[PDB]
C-alpha cells in the first residue's frame, strides 16, 4: 500500500563550500535525506540549480551512510567517471547533465552494478565545472565500464565525446575510457 514510490536506496544530498579559512566539517552541510521518488522531486524543486551556485560550491548525492569524502571506507579504493564542462556550458548543459546524473543514481540505472555506485558530485568553479559519478572499487573493470557506458548513453553524448575514469588515489590519469 505505497502512496509514494520507494527507492532502492536511501540518499543524502549535501552542500559544500570550498572556504579554506574554515574546517572541512564547518564547510559541509546536510540538505536532506530522502527515500522516495516524490520526496526527491520535493527537494529538487526547492533548492538552487547548480548553474546558479556560487563558484567554489559543490552539490553531492551519496547513499546514506557514505560520507561525501574519498577517505570514507566506501570511497577509499574507488574512483569516478568525470564529466568536464566549460563555464560557458553552465547555463545550457550543467543542470540537465546534473539532473540526469541524479536520475541514474536514484533510478538504479546500472543494473546490478548500481551497487558499486557510491554517489555523484557536481563542482562549480571559475575555471570550469565538473560532474562525476563515484564508484567504490576502481579495480572492478566490468562494473566500472558498464557504468561509464550507460552514463555516456544517458547524457546523450556523441561517440567522439570521450569520458575517463580516474581512481581517487591518482586524482589526489585515466584508468578507463568510454
Amino acid at each position: 500500500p505505497h502512496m509514494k514510490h520507494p527507492l532502492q536506496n536511501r540518499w543524502a544530498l549535501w552542500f559544500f563550500k570550498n572556504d579554506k579559512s574554515k574546517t572541512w566539517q564547518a564547510n559541509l552541510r546536510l540538505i536532506s535525506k530522502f527515500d522516495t521518488v516524490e520526496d526527491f522531486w520535493a527537494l529538487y524543486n526547492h533548492i538552487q540549480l547548480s548553474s546558479n551556485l556560487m563558484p567554489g560550491c559543490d552539490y553531492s548525492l551519496f547513499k546514506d551512510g557514505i560520507e561525501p569524502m574519498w577517505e570514507d571506507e566506501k570511497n577509499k579504493r574507488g574512483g569516478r567517471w568525470l564529466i568536464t564542462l566549460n563555464k560557458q556550458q553552465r547555463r545550457s548543459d550543467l543542470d540537465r547533465f546534473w539532473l540526469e546524473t541524479l536520475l541514474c543514481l536514484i533510478g538504479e540505472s546500472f543494473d546490478d552494478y548500481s551497487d558499486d555506485v557510491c554517489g555523484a558530485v557536481v563542482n562549480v568553479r571559475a575555471k570550469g565545472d565538473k560532474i562525476a559519478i563515484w564508484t567504490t572499487e576502481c579495480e572492478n573493470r566490468e562494473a566500472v565500464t558498464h557504468i561509464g557506458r550507460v552514463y555516456k548513453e544517458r547524457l546523450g553524448l556523441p561517440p567522439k565525446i570521450v569520458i575517463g575514469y580516474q581512481s581517487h588515489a591518482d586524482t589526489a590519469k585515466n584508468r578507463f575510457v568510454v
Binding site: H5, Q48, C57, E108
Partner: protein, 35 residues
Amino acid sequence: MTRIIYDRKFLMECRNSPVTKTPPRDLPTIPGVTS
C-alpha cells in the same frame, strides 16, 4: 524482493504529483541554496 529500478520516463512523470510542490518540512535555510 527484487531491485527497484525506475527509468527516466517514469521518474519525470512522478514530478507532476502535487506532493512534489510542497517543500521538505525540515528544509534548511541557506543563502544561495535554499535562501
